Design an enzyme around this catalytic site. Structure first.
Site, PDB file in Angstrom:
ATOM      1  CB  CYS A 157      -0.854  -0.126   1.500  1.00 57.07           C
ATOM      2  SG  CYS A 157      -2.308  -1.138   1.066  1.00 57.07           S
ATOM      3  CG  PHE A 208      -7.785  -5.213   0.123  1.00 57.48           C
ATOM      4  CD1 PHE A 208      -7.193  -3.764   0.484  1.00 57.48           C
ATOM      5  CD2 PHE A 208      -7.252  -6.151   0.576  1.00 57.48           C
ATOM      6  CE1 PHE A 208      -6.114  -3.780   1.442  1.00 57.48           C
ATOM      7  CE2 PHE A 208      -6.101  -6.016   1.374  1.00 57.48           C
ATOM      8  CZ  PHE A 208      -5.466  -4.902   1.926  1.00 57.48           C
ATOM      9  CG  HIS A 302      -2.907   4.275   0.932  1.00 58.27           C
ATOM     10  ND1 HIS A 302      -3.359   3.866   0.051  1.00 58.27           N
ATOM     11  CD2 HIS A 302      -2.991   3.022   1.954  1.00 58.27           C
ATOM     12  CE1 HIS A 302      -3.697   2.465   0.007  1.00 58.27           C
ATOM     13  NE2 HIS A 302      -3.408   2.040   1.236  1.00 58.27           N
ATOM     14  CG  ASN A 335      -6.549   0.065   0.680  1.00 51.16           C
ATOM     15  OD1 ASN A 335      -6.012   0.113  -0.406  1.00 51.16           O
ATOM     16  ND2 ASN A 335      -6.214  -0.447   1.850  1.00 51.16           N
TER      17      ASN A 335
END
Lengths: 389, 389
Positions: A157, A208, A302, A335
């Site tokens: 990530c 995700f 992020h 994400n």
């Protein structure tokens, strides 16, 4: 100098994104996931996962894996069944394909012929192969056979920071260089059925999503011909203290598996202030203008999960609108590992144009892009926006 | 410029190497390999492999895998048995460990404290993990927590060129940057028993050895303090024509598997002349001194196998001594994938010092480092030597 260098700061000249067409709304995901994995009897586990989705701050995600594909490949729906070869056969093809869609969008916006791309950085956490995803993408696009390629595998990530860190030096040290930067992530490499042994994998199942983003990065944009959107000015990387094993990811015969052994939001939020204060002191040294305040920077953070964002916002005292662009991407795409911060960069510049703000960074001059991943690694990029009309 | 750049060419300031202690002499390898894999009954296959070893131009190799380790892990001695998890458990530890040994040697030669390393590039074709081999090496060495890391996974045999291509821009674009570059390769990831289905894997069993090499790369060496050995002046990368599938490598549940679908020596030797002529024309443009002749360059050529070397030497008309340093490393260590060209660089500078030649490149001013690998990818680096006393 046998290879002439460039002069100005490495600049983002275009951004493209791409996602798989199939959407799963978070309100539907618990039934979809536990249904397709034959796990509706695990009633307690399913209610744990329902609560995770309810707090995820994700409204929808784009996923390569459909019910049809999962029904055709039951080893993916199982838990801890050997499946790596199958997953690789999928993502070794689909990751470059999705990256191609994003790259074509970036190239079209840029406006120059694709043979002016001199370098390529391809970053993914989904699959590995030789030749790699960089080679495959160059083939799909028809780039010049002499493009200088780099494939960044198993990054995780923080990779969106890493690719900018590297692209900065490629662009600035090579006159005329135009770097295609692609991050492409497909969760088929980690998707697995639920288990109360591995509640870690449940977090990923809530958060995700799939997606790819592409940049053109170069120094010295041609006036009235190329357009700069953000400038890369300072980069830093840090392994956060007392974070051994915070985020581990192993490529196993059952696919990619993630393990969370420490309080990741607490480690990030407790250490980020000193990292940013140091970075801003390096960029705005006293000897001279002082660093902007946090509320006068734009933020491309992020969104590893909502708790990271909430705890960073709280610890730094950020005004509630600072992370709005970040939270919008988390809400609409989840994400997407290394690709996510480039989606946020695109969302931010687009909002800024649409709302007629004075810069590509929501009206602010300076900004921060932050990636967090295995290490625990924090990638920091100090960015400058570009004035709008 | 918020990050000041350097001025002079990226330079190799130190080189360290390391190999596993266990040596297998090529004269012994056919019996060792076919014995430890319970394959002595495959009489025709064993005589094919014997001929391969007889023509390999490899006298010995250093291998992590011993008879004792293989006897303890029979899935490695089998053919096409699921084994990836076991191989990963080995190489995720042993690749950084071997790289640490090489890095410590390079740092000791360099002479500066290890906290002056600002960047790290770790390249390997053996294993993948998160955090990666770069993180593991930084931990083993105790590098600064803010070292800017990059892990280059699944590169293959061109990776020694790739790391220099990248390190060049890191060093030149960052004032004071000192880049630790590590290539570490351990064949436990590909070792498997013999089969007449996969004669490709037999080639690797004759040629591939284990080893790690480490550089310190930086611009503007401190006078009388640091010592430059080679300078990086020009870099190029090419996908050779009509080479699709020439070298494929897949990370499977049975480990890493290689496939050779085309005449690799013919593709390399047929195309290398035009690549080098172009590179040398870029470095020595007419408008001015002409390029040195091939016999007046020093040669650091990846020895993928003896046929590549023989056919390149023949096609380019190289005098028989030009590839001597390259062939010496192949003879004593085999093909160590990405690490090999850095072993050759070390062999060449050491011979040059010992024989009191006038430069670190065997008495020549300019030279060429070539890596070849999946793509088929050719990495070209034009180097300058440094004068000796």
């Amino acid at each position: 100098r046998k290879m002439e260098r460039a002069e100005g700061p490495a600049s983002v000249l275009a951004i493209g994104t791409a996602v798989p067409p199939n959407v799963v709304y978070q309100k539907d995901y618990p039934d979809f996931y536990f249904g397709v994995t034959n796990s509706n009897h695990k009633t307690e586990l399913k209610d744990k996962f329902q609560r995770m989705c309810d707090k995820s701050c994700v409204s929808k995600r784009h996923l390569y894996l459909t019910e049809e594909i999962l029904k055709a490949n039951p080893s993916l729906c199982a838990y801890w069944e050997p499946s790596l070869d199958l997953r690789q056969d999928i993502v070794v093809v689909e990751v470059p394909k999705l990256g191609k869609q994003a790259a074509s969008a970036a190239i079209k916006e840029w406006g120059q012929p694709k043979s002016k791309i001199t370098h390529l950085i391809f970053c993914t956490t989904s699959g590995v192969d030789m030749p790699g995803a960089d080679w495959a993408l160059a083939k799909l696009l028809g780039l010049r056979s002499s493009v200088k390629r780099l494939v960044l595998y198993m990054q995780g990530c923080y990779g969106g920071g890493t690719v900018l860190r590297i692209a900065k030096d490629l662009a600035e040290n090579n006159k005329g260089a135009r770097v295609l930067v692609v991050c492409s992530e497909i969760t088929a490499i980690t998707f697995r059925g639920p288990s109360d042994t591995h509640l870690d994998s449940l977090v990923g199942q809530a958060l995700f999503g799939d997606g790819a983003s592409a940049l053109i990065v170069g120094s010295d944009p041609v006036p009235a011909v190329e357009r700069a959107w953000f400038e890369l000015h300072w980069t830093g990387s840090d392994i956060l203290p007392n974070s051994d094993g915070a985020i581990d990811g192993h490529l196993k015969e059952v696919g990619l598996t993630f393990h969370l052994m420490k309080d990741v939001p607490a480690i990030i939020s407790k250490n980020i202030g000193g990292i940013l204060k140091d970075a801003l002191a390096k960029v705005f040294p006293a000897a001279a203008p002082p660093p902007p305040t946090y509320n006068d920077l734009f933020w491309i953070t992020h969104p590893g999960g909502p708790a990271i964002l909430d705890q960073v916002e709280d610890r730094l005292g950020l005004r509630k609108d600072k992370l709005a662009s970040t939270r919008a991407v988390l809400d609409q795409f989840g994400n997407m590992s290394s690709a996510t911060v480039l989606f946020i960069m695109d969302e931010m510049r687009k909002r800024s144009v649409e709302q007629q703000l004075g810069t590509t960074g929501e009206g602010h001059e300076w900004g921060l892009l932050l990636g967090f991943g295995p290490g625990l690694t924090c990638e920091t990029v100090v960015l400058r926006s570009v004035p709008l009309v």
